[PDB]
Amino acid sequence: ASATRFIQWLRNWASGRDLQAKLQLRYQEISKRTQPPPKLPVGPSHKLSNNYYCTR
Amino acid sequence: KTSFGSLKDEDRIFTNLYGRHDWRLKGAQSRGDWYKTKEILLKGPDWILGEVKTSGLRGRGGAGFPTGLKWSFMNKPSDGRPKYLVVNADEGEPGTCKDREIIRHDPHKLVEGCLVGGRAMGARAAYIYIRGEFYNEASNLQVAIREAYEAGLIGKNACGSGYDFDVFVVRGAGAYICGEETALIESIEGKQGKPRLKPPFPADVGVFGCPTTVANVETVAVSPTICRRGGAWFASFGRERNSGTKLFNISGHVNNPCTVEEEMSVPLKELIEKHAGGVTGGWDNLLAVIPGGSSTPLIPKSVCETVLMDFDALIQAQTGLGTAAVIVMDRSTDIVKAIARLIEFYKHESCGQCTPCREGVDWMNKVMARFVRGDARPAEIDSLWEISKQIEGHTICALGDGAAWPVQGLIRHFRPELEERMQQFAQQH
Ligand SMILES: Cc1cc2nc3c(=O)[nH]c(=O)nc-3n(C[C@H](O)[C@H](O)[C@H](O)COP(=O)(O)O)c2cc1C
Ligand code: SF4
Predict the structure, then answer these.
(1) Which segments within B294-372 are labelled E, that is strand?
(2) How far is the C-alpha of B353 from the C-alpha of B59, rounded, in Å?
C-alpha cells in the first residue's frame, strides 16, 4: 500500500493487472483480534418435555 | 332409581355419628348392635361372605375394591398358620376424619364388625391399627372392647357360638404411610412402615407372615348391619356397582363443615348445600373441589355442577371417590398454593423406600414451590406433568400415585393460572 504512484504504474503494467485492488498483504480490512463474546445456540434435544432418549 | 340422596334416618347405619347417645355397650345394644350376633356366626362363613357380596359393598379406605370378593381370598382351608383380620384405623388421608367418629362414638359397631368379618375369614383375632394421635379415641375403643369381653360377646366362645376371637388395639406412632395395607402390617410387626411388594398378597403372607385381610374401619363396621338387614337392603341404595350408604366429610370453604352419612351417588352439589350449608359466599363463589381426600385430583366448578358422588361417576370426571372427603375451595383460594401444600404433605409422608417417590415427590415439591411464586418458565409445566407420570405406576405403593394425581389435576384444570403467575413474576423481575 505504500508504493509510490510510479511503482504502482510500473508493476501494474508489467503484470497486466490492477494489482492495487487485490493486494496479497492484509491491512485494516481484517477482523479485529478481540471480538465480543459469543452466545452459541443449543441443539434440538435441549427440551424439558417430549424428549425421551428412546425416541431419538 | 335415577335420583339418589335424602337418605332417611331409619336407613342410616352409624346412628350415633354425633355422639349424642350413649356410646357404651348399653347404648349400643339399644340401637341394635350385638343383636342376633350368635345366629349370624352360626350361619357360616360362606353365608356371611355371600351377604357382603350381594350388598355390593366396596372398600371405604380409598381404593374401593369389592369387599365380598376381597374377603373371600381368606375363605380357604387351614395350612397350620393362624389367620388374622387387620382393621385399618390409621385414618391419615388429609380431609378425611370419618373413621374417627366410628371409633369414638360407635365403637361397638366396629367391635361387632371385627367378629363377624373375622368369622367369615376364619381369623382367630383382629388387630385394630389406630393412629397414635387418636389417643382418646383408642381409649374409648379399649373400653368398648373390655365391655364385649366381660359380656362374653368376644373372646372364648364369642356370643355363645363356640368361636374364639380376640380383638387387639395397636397404636401407630405418626406416619401417614402406615395406612397403606402392607406398610400397616410391617408397622404391627415392629418395623418401619414401609410397604411390601406384591406378590405375595396379604391373604397368603400377611401379618407375622400369616394369611391376613386388611379392611377399613367403615368397611368392617357396616358388615354386621348388612348381615342383619340383608345384602339386598344395602344394594337398594346408590347406583349399580356403587351400592350402599357412605360417610362424607365436607371441609374447607363451606358454611357448616361436618361429617354426615348419605346415599352413594348423591350429587356433589346437593351434598354440599343440603348438609354443609353451601359454599362460603354462595355457590357461584366455588372454585374447585377435591372430592375424595388429598390424593384425588381436583375438579373445577363446572364439573362440580352435575357430578355424582360415587366411584364410577368420579372416575368419569378424571378423579375418584377416594375416602369421600370433600375439600371445598372457593374463589378467594390460592389454588396453586393449596395444591403445593398437599405436595409438601406427601413429601413429608413418603417412606423413602423406593426411588420414584423418595426422589420424585421431593422434586415435584421443589417445582411446586417455585410455581407458587411464578419463579419458573411455562415449559416447566409440561416437564412437571411428565415427571408426575414417571412416578405414577412405577412405585411400590399407591402413595406415589397419590402425590402425582393432585399435580395432574392442577395442570389439567388450572394451567392458565400457572402461566399467569409466571408472567407476573417475569415482568416484576
Ligand atoms: C398412602 C396411603 C394411605 C392410606 N391410608 C389409609 C387409611 O388411612 N385408612 C384406610 O382404611 N386405608 C388407607 N389406605 C388404603 C389401604 O392401603 C387399603 O387399600 C385399605 O385399607 C383396604 O381396606 P378396604 O378394602 O376396606 O378399603 C391407604 C393407602 C395408601 C397408599
Ligand atoms: S411410593 Fe413412596 S411411600 Fe410408597 S413405598 Fe415408595 S417411597 Fe415408600
Answers:
(1) 299-300, 308-309, 325-330
(2) 26
Q: Kind of pairing, strands B163-171 and B155-158?
A: antiparallel
Classify burial at B395, counting beta carbons within 10 Å of its beta carbon; exposed 0-12, middle 13-18, buried 19 or more. buried
Question: Cβ distance B115 to B154 under 8 Å?
Answer: yes
| Annotated binding residue B268 | no
Residues B371/B421, Cβ–Cβ less than 8 Å: yes
Measure the CA–CA gap between B428 and B211, rounded to whole angstroms.
Answer: 61
SS3 string, B173-228, reads CCCHHHHCHHHHHHHHCCCCCCCCCCCCCCCCCCHHHCCEEEEEHHHHHCHHHHHH
Question: Hey, are the CB atoms on A48 and B385 less than 8 Å from each other?
Answer: no
Contact B383 A48 (CB under 8 A): yes
Rg of chain B in Å (alpha carbons)? 22
DSSP A21: G
**Phi and psi, residue A32, nearest 5°:** -60, 145
- Please give the Cα distance from B282 to B2 (Å, whole number): 27
Q: What is the resolution of this structure in A?
A: 2.3
Method: cryo-EM
Closest-CA distance, B86 to chain A, in angstroms, reads: 43
Estimate to the nearest angstrom the gap between the alpha carbon of B283 and the chain centroid: 27
* Cα–Cα distance for residue pair B222/B225, rounded to 1 Å: 6
Q: Does domain B25-236 have CATH number 3.40.50.11540?
A: yes
B282 Ramachandran zone, left/alpha/beta (phi>0; psi -120 to 50): left
Sequence-ordered strand ranges (E) for B257-362: 258-263, 266-267, 286-290, 299-300, 308-309, 325-330
Report d(CA B409, CA B190) in Å as an integer. Answer: 36
Place of cell 343440603: B274
Q: Does A50 touch chain B (CB under 8 A)?
A: yes
Is the Cβ of A42 closer than 8 Å to some Cβ of chain B?
Answer: no
Alpha-carbon distance A50 to nearest alpha carbon in chain B (angstroms): 8
- In this complex, do B383 and A50 lie within 8 Å of one another by their Cβ atoms? no
